[PDB]
Amino acid sequence: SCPHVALLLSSGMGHLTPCLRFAATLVQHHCRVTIITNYPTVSVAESRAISLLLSDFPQITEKQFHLLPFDPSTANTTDPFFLRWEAIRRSAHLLNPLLSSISPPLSALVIDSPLVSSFVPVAANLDLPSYVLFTSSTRMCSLQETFPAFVASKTNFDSIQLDDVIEIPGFSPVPVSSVPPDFLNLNHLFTTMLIQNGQSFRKANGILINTFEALEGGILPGINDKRAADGLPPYCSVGPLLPCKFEKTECSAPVKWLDDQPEGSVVYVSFGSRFALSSEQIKELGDGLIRSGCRFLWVVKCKKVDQEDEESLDELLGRDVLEKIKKYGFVIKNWVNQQEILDHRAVGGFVTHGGWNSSMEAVWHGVPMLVWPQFGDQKINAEVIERSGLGMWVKRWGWGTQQLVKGEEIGERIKDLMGNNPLRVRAKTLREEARKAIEVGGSSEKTLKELIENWK
Amino acid sequence: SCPHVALLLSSGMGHLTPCLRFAATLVQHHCRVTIITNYPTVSVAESRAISLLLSDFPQITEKQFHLLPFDPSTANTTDPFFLRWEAIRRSAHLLNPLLSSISPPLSALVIDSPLVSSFVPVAANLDLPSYVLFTSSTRMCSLQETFPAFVASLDDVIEIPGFSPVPVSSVPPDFLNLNHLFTTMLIQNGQSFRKANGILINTFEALEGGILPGINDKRAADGLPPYCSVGPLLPCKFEKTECSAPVKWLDDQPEGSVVYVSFGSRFALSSEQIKELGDGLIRSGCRFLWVVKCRDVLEKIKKYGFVIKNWVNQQEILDHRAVGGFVTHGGWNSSMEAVWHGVPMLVWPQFGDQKINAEVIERSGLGMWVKRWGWGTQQLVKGEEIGERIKDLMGNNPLRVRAKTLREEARKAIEVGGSSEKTLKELIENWK
Ligand SMILES: O=c1ccn([C@@H]2O[C@H](COP(=O)(O)OP(=O)(O)O)[C@@H](O)[C@H]2O)c(=O)[nH]1
Ligand SMILES: O=c1ccn([C@@H]2O[C@H](COP(=O)(O)OP(=O)(O)O)[C@@H](O)[C@H]2O)c(=O)[nH]1
C-alpha cells in the first residue's frame, strides 16, 4: 500500500521549500504525493523550485488551485506574500471539488500553516485527516497557539502592553520584545490570520514541525504527553527536512569562489528570500564586512520580491563603494543556493536573519550562526538557536527593522562569531544528532514511520 | 496500491543502463522497485552507476545475489561480461528463497534478456508474472526468437516475422559459430521468450512504423507474449552533470558543428584504427568530441577537436546544441539516446547486433551506415574514407530534418496519451 498525500501550498520560499522537501521525503517513504500549486507565484524562485521538483520527481502530481479574483484594497497589509495567502484563503470553498477529483483517493491533506484556519474545515467535510506543516520553531508554534488566549485577556492591547511576558506551555516564557512586531498591531492582516490559524491548529490530526528532539533538549516528549492529556494534536517532529537533489548545482559561481578559500574562513551572510535591508543598513553592513577582517559571502536584496529587485547594486552604493567591497569578499545581488554554500568547508559561520529554514539548514550542516532578527518569528527563533548552543544573538541590536547597527559594531560581532569555539564544538555535536534523527531508529524517522503506518 | 517489481540485473554496462533507467521509470510510474545485484561488478562503471541510482532513489531497495563459485575453465568463451552471465545462470536455483523473502509481495519480475531461459522457471515457482527486458532493437528481438527454428534446418537470408528478412551478413558473427557460450544462451533464451509474460523493448511505436500493433495481434493468436513498447528510456537524474570538462568545451563551439564519436563502454578500437580514425577526424575539417578506449600527433588532434580517454556522459553530450552528429558503434542504447536528442548518426557496426541496429537506423531515416566498412572488428578503414563519410554526415540536411521530426515523435510517446505511456500504464494496470 502507498498512502496518497496532498500538499496545499502558499506563498513564499520559506513555506515552499519545507513543503517540497517534505513532499520529497514522503515520496521516498513509499507515499504518493500530490502538490496543490497556485499561479502566478509572487517570486521567480518559487516557480523554479516547483518545476525542478516536478522535473526530478515525475511521480509527484500537480493540481492547480485557481483562486478567485482578488481585490488587494480589502486587505490590511501591503506585503505581496501575505496578500497571496489571503487570496488563497478567500478561495477556500473551491478546494473541495478539486480534492474529490484527485485519484487515487487521498489519505491525508497536509495544510500549509498560514492556510490552516480557512482550509481545515474543507478537509473535515471530506473526512480527510489534516496535518499542519509548521515552518517555524516549536517555540513559535506554541506562542501562536497561546497568543489568541493572551490578547483576549487584555482590555486594551495598546497601553496594558508594556514588556511583560507571555507564558508558553513547556517552554521558557516569551517577552513581548521577542514577539513579532506585527502582533502588537492586532487589526493587521498578518496578526488576524495567525490568530485564526493558531486557534484552528487543534482541529488538525497533527502538526508537522521541522525539528528533531535532541535540538530542544528533552522537553518534547513531556509536552506531547500533556498535549495528549489535554486532547490536543501531537507535535510531530520530522526535521531536519532534507534538501532535495535539485537544490545542489555543483558548478555555481559562488560555490567555485568558495573552493579557492581556506576552510572555515568564510562568513556567509543572508537574510532570507522575502526581506531586504534598508539602504542605510546595507551601506553599513558592507562597511562592517570590510572591518571584520574575515572572508565573506554576502547575499544582498534591495526589495522583497526578486522580480522587482531590478535596481543595480551600483545605484544603491555607488560604483566605487561597491567596487571596494568586492575586493574583500564575494558579493552577489541574486538568488544563491544557501544549503549548498553552508555545506562548503570554507564556510565557518553564518550571519542570518533568523528564519527557521536557514537556521535548520545551518543546524544540518554544522555552521555556527550570528542571528540578527529583523521581524516576525526571528527573535523567538533566535532564542531557540542560542539555547541550542549553536548560535549567538545580540539582544543589544534589537529588531533590524526598527534599529540601525553601524559598521564598527557589525565587524566586531563577526569577529566574535568567527572565533567562538563553543559554537564550533556544538555545531559538530548538534549536526551528528540531526543526522541520527533521520537515520533509521532516529527520533524523526520514527515519527514519520508512525504517520505513514496510520494511513494505512 | 503500489505494485512491487523485482529487477534481475546481469553484468554488462550495456545491459545495466537500461535496467537502471527502467527501474527509475517504474518508480516514476508508482511502483516499488527492488533490484537484484551481484558483487563484485565486472567494471567500476557498473558499481558507480548502481550506487548513484541507490543514492538518488532511496525507496528502491537492493538485495544482493550471492552466486555459486563459477568454474571459468568452461567458460565456452573468454569474455568477462559474458562469463558472469553463466556464473549467474549456474546459481539460478538460489534465487527462489531470495525472491520469496522480498516484502511487500512482488507483482512482477523483470528479468534481463541474457538470463531469461535460466530464470523464467524461477518466476513460475513464485506464481510471478515474468517480463524480459530486451536491450536491443525490435528487429534483433525477432531474429532472436526465429533463430532457433532456423538452425533446425552465406549470402542467404533468415525469415523474420513482422520485419524485412535479415541477411546472414548482418547476423552477429558468433551466431554462425555454434558451441559458443554466447550462442548457446541466445538459443536457449530465444526458445524461452515464449514462456515469459511480456517482452520489454526500449522503443516507441512511431519508430518502427505502425507494424507493432499488427505484430501483437499475430503474436497473441499463436499464444505468444506481447511486445511492450516503453521507449525511449530517458536517462536517470544522476546521469547529468552541469559541468564536465567536455561540456565546458562544447560551450565554446558553434551550434551543431561538432561530431561526437563513441563506440560504447565494452569495445576498444585497434591501435591501427585509432591512428587511422585520428587522421580522418583531422581530414574532415570539422570539430569533434572523440572518446577513445584501448604523442606528436596528440597535440595536432587537440588543435581542431577534443580528445578524451575516459567515461563520458554520452546523453548530456548528445543533448548539447554544439553536437551536429554521432559516429556510433550502433549500440541500441547509444542509438536511442541519439533518437531522444535528435542527433543524426553515422553508424559504424563493429560486432554483435550493431549491423542489425544499423539496418533499423537506416530505415528510420535518422542515420547513414556504411556497408562498405562491414565490421570494425573485421575491417580497417583509412582516414581518407572516414573523413568523406563524416563530411557527408555533417552536410546531410535531410538527416537532420528527420532527426528533429523523430525527437518530437519520441517525446510525444512518453507524454500523456503517448504511445509508450499507454503500454506502460496498461502493464501496471494489470499487475495491478
Ligand atoms: O538567496 C537565497 C535566499 C534564500 N534561500 C533559501 O530560502 C529559504 C528561506 O527560508 P527562511 O526560513 O529563511 O524563510 P524566509 O526568511 O526567507 O521567509 C532557505 O531555506 C534558504 O535556503 C536560498 O537558497 N538562497
Ligand atoms: O563513454 C561512454 C560510453 C558509454 N556510455 C553509455 O553506456 C551506454 C552503452 O550502451 P550500448 O548500447 O552502446 O551498449 P554497448 O555496445 O556499449 O555494450 C550508452 O547508453 C551510453 O550512454 C557513456 O555514457 N559514456
- A449 inside 8 A of chain B by CB: no
Q: Is the peptide bond before B40 cis (omega within 30 degrees of 0)?
A: yes
Q: What DSSP string runs through A381-448?
A: HHHHHHHHTSEEE-GGG--TTT----HHHHHHHHHHHHT-HHHHHHHHHHHHHHHHHHSTTSHHHHHH
DSSP SS3 for A290: helix
Contact: A59, B28; criterion CB under 8 Å = yes
Residue B15 among the catalytic residues = yes
Contact: B59, A32; criterion CB under 8 Å = no
Chain A CA closest to residue B415: A58
- A58 inside 8 A of chain B by CB: yes
Query: What torsion, rounded to 10 degrees, do the Cα atoms B200, B202, B207, B211 define?
Result: -10
- B59 inside 8 A of chain A by CB: yes
Option in B1, B56, B242 nearest A1 (CB): B1
Option in A1, A32, A245 nearest B56 (CB): A245
Residue A182 among the catalytic residues = no
Q: Whose CA is nearest to atom 23 of ligand 1?
A: A338
Cβ(B13) to ligand 2 under 6 A? Answer: yes
**Residues A80, A305: contact at Cβ < 8 Å?**
yes
Does residue B283 sit in the same domain as residue B218? Answer: no
Resolution (A): 2.8
Contact: B2, A32; criterion CB under 8 Å = yes
CA of A42 to the centre of ligand 1 (A): 15
Q: Is the peptide bond before A104 cis (omega within 30 degrees of 0)?
A: yes
- B103 inside 8 A of chain A by CB: no
Contact: B241, A249; criterion CB under 8 Å = no
Mutation for testing the A interface, residue in B21, B28, B52, B59 having most A CBs under 10 Å:
B59
Does residue A94 sit in the same domain as residue A180? Answer: yes
Does residue B23 sit in the same domain as residue B147? Answer: yes
Q: What is the largest CA-CA distance in chain B?
A: 64
C-alpha cell of residue A346: 570554507
Does residue A228 sit in the same domain as residue A363? Answer: no
Assign residue B195 the CATH number of its domain. 3.40.50.2000
Does residue A409 sit in the same domain as residue A444? Answer: no
- A51 inside 8 A of chain B by CB: no
DSSP designation for B19: H
Secondary element (H or E) of residue A107: none
Q: Phi/psi class of residue B45: alpha, beta or left (left: φ > 0; alpha: ψ in -120 to 50)? A: alpha
* CA end-to-end span of chain A: 7
Q: Point out which residues pair with A175 in neighbouring strands.
A: A165
Does residue B168 sit in the same domain as residue B247? Answer: no
Contact: A28, B243; criterion CB under 8 Å = no
Option in A28, A58, A249 nearest B242 (CB): A249
Does residue A258 sit in the same domain as residue A238? Answer: no
Mutation for testing the B interface, residue in A28, A340, A448 having most B CBs under 10 Å:
A28
CA B160 – CA B214 distance, rounded (Å): 14
DSSP designation for B11: S
Does residue B89 sit in the same domain as residue B226? Answer: yes
Q: By CB neighbour count within 10 A (0-12 exposed, 13-18 middle, 19+ buried), where does A280 fall?
A: exposed
Helices (H), A28-168: 44-56, 80-89, 95-101, 116-125, 138-152
Query: How many distinct structural domains can be found in chain A?
Result: 2
Does residue B383 sit in the same domain as residue B272? Answer: yes
Instruction: List the one residue out of B352, B354, B346 whose CA is nearest residue B260.
Output: B346
CA A447 – CA A212 distance, rounded (Å): 10
Does residue A392 sit in the same domain as residue A446? Answer: no
Does residue B10 sit in the same domain as residue B105? Answer: yes
Task: Identify the domain containing residue B380 by its residue range.
Answer: 242-410
Does residue A163 sit in the same domain as residue A202? Answer: yes
